[PDB]
Amino acid sequence: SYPAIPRIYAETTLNMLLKRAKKPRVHSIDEYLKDGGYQALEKALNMSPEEIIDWVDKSTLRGRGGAGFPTGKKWKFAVQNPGPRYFICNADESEPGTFKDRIIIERDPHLLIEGIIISSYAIGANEAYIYIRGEYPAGYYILRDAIEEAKKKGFLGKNILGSGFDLEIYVARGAGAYICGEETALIESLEGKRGHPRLKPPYPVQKGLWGKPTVVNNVETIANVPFIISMGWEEYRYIGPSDYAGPKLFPVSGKVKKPGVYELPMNTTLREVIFKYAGGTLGNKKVKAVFSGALDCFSSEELDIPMDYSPLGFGGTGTVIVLTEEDDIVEAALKIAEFYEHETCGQCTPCRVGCYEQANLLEKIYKGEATEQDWEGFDFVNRNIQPTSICGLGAVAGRLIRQTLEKFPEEWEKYRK
């Protein structure tokens, strides 16, 4: 028995990551095994780690946590450094509009576990972690139970299936901080400390948990690894466009008829996600904007872009928050400002004061209590959150809001008068 979870709608054209997770329930190890589960792990353990890295590289798998870093290449960087090494699954998923990772965790936990075991073997890690946000208590209990099932069946512990490979997976819980999904803050939290990002470089693969080589990968990234091994890298690369291959999860919310998670190839366009898959807009109103989580704002002139990691592509997490013609963009911008105000860790001065002031002043603007100086101040602050920042939060806390200032000047002007 697990805590109540909303039954998020899920749909797939590929039947891979969502083969089981399209049904809103826990799939336990027997059901997973019936579907051929853990056979990829058995195959992997008969390959060398170097081979596995090679396959993951050639697959074109890129980081699904949002930055799109090539996964195999990340692994290669780790393994050129002396061990011991650690493998971390990042399940902190806390970006606004983002709920792609939790449906893997809560419905098909063995897919993630199998992926972690294969990845850990690939990089020579005997100790792996899942760091799951505190606000996913059900995901935590489900993973703990799943790991015990895996132990029962001999997929974890010492000398897994006679391979000589040893692995333990530890499940850690967050306790309210968005910043703990930043890979270095995540590591600080695993070490028992406040979630304060470290200056990079070094990257975790050089210096991570307890200062040792550490790979951090997103839930969704890791969930791809069993498919790469099962199908082979060439077959996996047939999925979607050859330069951005494989299944991708798209969490769609806001003013769509069918909000939920869609598993689709990355040559799908943003317009297709909204209209072909998510059923179009509530009330068939016109699309005004799409927020790519709290990272980017796309206008209705930008809907024919591919959902890939190309320069002109949607990128990010694949998160699609749809706003329609009657949604006030300044009100929406305020919510984004409030988010960053709430989550800066405060180590860097322009991030600390800038996230606060951006929200403080935008509230005044929104409520019609902003002076001329507050207006000019808001503009300045928005442009000056990034300087000296040591992590991506400060780098982007002004980004989406700036895009709304550029793409929706008429709405903002209405507020400046």
């Binding site: 805590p3 109540a4 979870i5 909303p6 039954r7 998020i8 709608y9 998923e93 806390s94 970006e95 606004p96 509009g97 983002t98 709920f99 990772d101 939790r102 100790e127 946000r133 505190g134 606000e135 996913y136 208590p137 059900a138 530890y170 850690a172 819980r173 967050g174 306790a175 309210g176 901080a177 968005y178 939290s189 695993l190 070490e191 028992g192 400390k193 406040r194 979630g195 969490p251 769609v252 919310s253 806001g254 003013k255 909000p259 939920g260 998670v261 927020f291 709290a294 928050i321 706003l323 949604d327 009100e331 929406a332 919510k335 984004i336 409030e338 988010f339 709430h342 989550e343």
Partner: protein
């Protein structure tokens, strides 16, 4: 002097023995403490520090940092209400109003019986089911006041 009841101390010891290093269990322990008492009692922190082999000011700073922990208000049930962009768009204010109608409290406040506290939170990662709330570990889409009333009636 403050001591942990044995049933709680036992659970804390399991967490502390779970990871390779004791200090890694700090958040699991604090979750356990908050589960037991309905908040983090300030007096609990010195014994926990001892169990973790950490300085007290370390533990104090960690409690302060992590927004899920509450040292102020005891509450049997925490109603976490998402106030981020999607839930705001889809009816956070309707949910808050319904909560006020049923319970007579606003965000940040506790019912007089100490039963319910409304906690405004950032995106809970269930945005397709907006507007979202949790009641302790349980999580729900808000549909209407009549529906919310039925959900809350299950917490006694």
């Amino acid at each position: 002097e403050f001591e942990f009841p044995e049933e709680l101390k036992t659970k804390l010891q399991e967490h502390i023995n779970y990871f390779p290093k004791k200090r890694q269990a700090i958040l699991l322990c604090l979750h356990e403490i908050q589960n037991y008492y309905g908040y983090i009692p300030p007096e609990s922190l010195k014994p926990l520090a001892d169990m973790l082999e950490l300085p007290l000011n370390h533990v104090e700073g960690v409690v302060a940092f992590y927004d899920m922990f509450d040292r102020e208000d005891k509450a049997k049930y925490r109603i976490r209400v998402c106030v981020s962009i999607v839930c705001h768009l889809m009816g956070t204010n309707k949910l808050l109003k319904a909560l006020e109608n049923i319970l007579g409290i606003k965000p940040g406040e506790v019912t007089p019986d100490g039963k319910f506290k409304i906690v405004p939170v950032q995106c809970l990662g269930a945005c397709s089911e907006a507007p979202v709330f949790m009641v302790n570990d349980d999580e729900y889409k808000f549909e209407s006041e009549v529906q919310l009333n039925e959900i809350l009636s299950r917490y006694t």
